Design a protein around this ligand. Structure first.
Ligand code: A2H
Ligand code: A2H
Lengths: 274, 274
């Protein structure tokens, strides 16, 4: 590193009781790291690690505070993310830090994030979200088992048309009916992929082709997925043509940063480094 | 961590040729991390690791830039510090980042610091510096061998009256005449300690007493130094009375943050986390 990402804010549309008691009326967002802001037009769902443990982090609504109470008064926004990502967010001014009282005495200043609580990925499966740019009104949180808690926020947005991982993990849900009974996954949470990008070689549903081309059978086949992902990434950046949005018609390489800046302008996204 | 520090900017008063060719007319500062902003009244010298390798980092004069040339135009300030500290500075907005061209292709953004070059601590020994708050007009860079390159910036300010390390390392220079011949250390670079803080138990030159009390013989006796340092730190914060500056008369615990904020206001210091 360091590597640069776009942090995508997915707004919880209906906050459940178990969070509502802790967040007390604040806006809550699930926050995902992506390398591909231009693909937000094709989001079908959101991915979380079922046994991942995530923080409920107090965030700026968009200086290190001395009082917990003043931060709590001044921030009306919570981000669900890995503790680890929250610290990176803090260094970079995205969430507040306070001078913590949890250890030591007043002769040292120990900056800490304000974490209201802890939440397991499992508990969030089924949560409705307003996401930017996708035509779907609401998309839903679903389990992905390939998620590393040591990268990004541990939360990942799903664009199955142009991500081999996302295609593979949604297919595992679509086929394996034990998986759906287990996590109590309703049918209406599983949304259809969307055509968003033309790749002149492969057409408009490039992730499925590549998953067939590498003979990928589930989300777990990581060595092959890695090869699919590296191929799709470069070919789509240089040769992919957007068929959605303001920059419809343009190549990804020419539109990507413009799309990213409009998401940032509109409050859907932030620049993030780790 | 994370731990909070004050970054002290020590301005090079006479920039030598070997740096002048690389920095090309820019203001240069040597940057030190301290836990004790209130002790800047007693600075006698600055400490560097002789075989430490430091960056010449482009800094804001006080958004990730796409062009090296625009950063170079917009920044007239260089900070000498460890590469590692510079990255922390970058995350925290203290020095610019650029989208680097050193590896890969334009499909990924790789934020990098702008390092003009490399410099060994040895090469800086004898450099004259304007430091804040000390009565001395100029203080000088000298070698300290206990410095860890994995902490702070690898550069440390020297307050021998109230730091056991600083007292011990200056004494090693004062006594050991081979050490002075080796690094070519002139006499006029070795400045006398200054009384700055009364500790009701020990008086006004508390570091020397403690070095005697722990029977500390050189800067290398780290296990004992650790005990001296932990004792002096807490006793001075809670019981130490300043005899210098605007808050002369006051206890350190009441003056410390006020002093720190005035250094920040006046452009001598910055808040720094690692
Ligand atoms: C690798 C190509 O990634 C692609 C390719 C196509 C598309 Cl359409 C996308 C992405 B990408 O998914 C996120 C993020 O961008 C990408 C970050 O990859 P890097 O190795 O951590 O640098 O991996 C995914 N990611 C982020 N955090 C993750 C985590 N904790 N665990 C597993 N995967 C994660 O976003 C879109 C929609 N998913
Ligand atoms: C430990 C008490 O430190 C004292 C005690 C008294 C006084 Cl008057 C001072 C400090 B203190 O010296 C710096 C800095 O503050 C302190 C940081 O200690 P922590 O363990 O890295 O958190 O250690 C020192 N330090 C910073 N970076 C260092 C490094 N890379 N290597 C060795 N020591 C370093 O500042 C003043 C003037 N020197």
């Amino acid at each position: 590193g360091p590597q640069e990402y776009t942090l995508i804010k997915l707004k919880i549309h209906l906050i459940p009781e178990f969070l509502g008691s802790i967040v007390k009326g604040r806006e809550v967002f699930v926050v995902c790291a992506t390398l591909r802001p231009e693909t937000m037009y094709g989001q079908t769902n959101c991915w979380i690690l079922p046994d991942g443990e995530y923080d409920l982090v107090l965030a700026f609504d968009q200086k290190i505070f001395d009082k917990y109470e003043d931060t709590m008064k001044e921030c009306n926004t919570v981000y669900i993310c890995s503790e680890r990502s929250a610290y990176n967010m803090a260094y970079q001014g995205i969430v507040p830090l306070i001078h913590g009282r949890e250890q030591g005495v007043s002769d040292k200043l120990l900056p800490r994030i304000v974490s209201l609580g802890k939440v397991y990925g499992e508990q969030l499966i089924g949560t409705p979200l307003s996401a930017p740019m996708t035509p779907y009104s609401l998309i839903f949180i679903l389990p992905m088992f390939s998620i590393s808690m040591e990268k990004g926020t541990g939360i990942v947005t799903s664009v199955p048309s142009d991500s081999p991982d996302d295609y593979a993990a949604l297919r595992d849900i679509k086929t394996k009916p034990l998986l759906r009974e287990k996590y109590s996954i309703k049918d209406e949470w599983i949304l259809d992929p969307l055509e968003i990008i033309e790749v002149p070689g492969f057409g408009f549903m490039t992730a499925e082709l590549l998953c067939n081309q590498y003979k990928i059978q589930s989300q777990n086949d990581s060595a092959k997925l890695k090869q699919a992902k590296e191929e799709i990434y470069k070919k789509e950046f240089y040769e992919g043509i957007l068929i959605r949005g303001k920059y419809s018609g343009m190549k990804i390489c020419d539109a990507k940063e413009l799309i990213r800046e409009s998401l940032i302008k509109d409050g859907y996204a932030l620049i993030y480094l780790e």
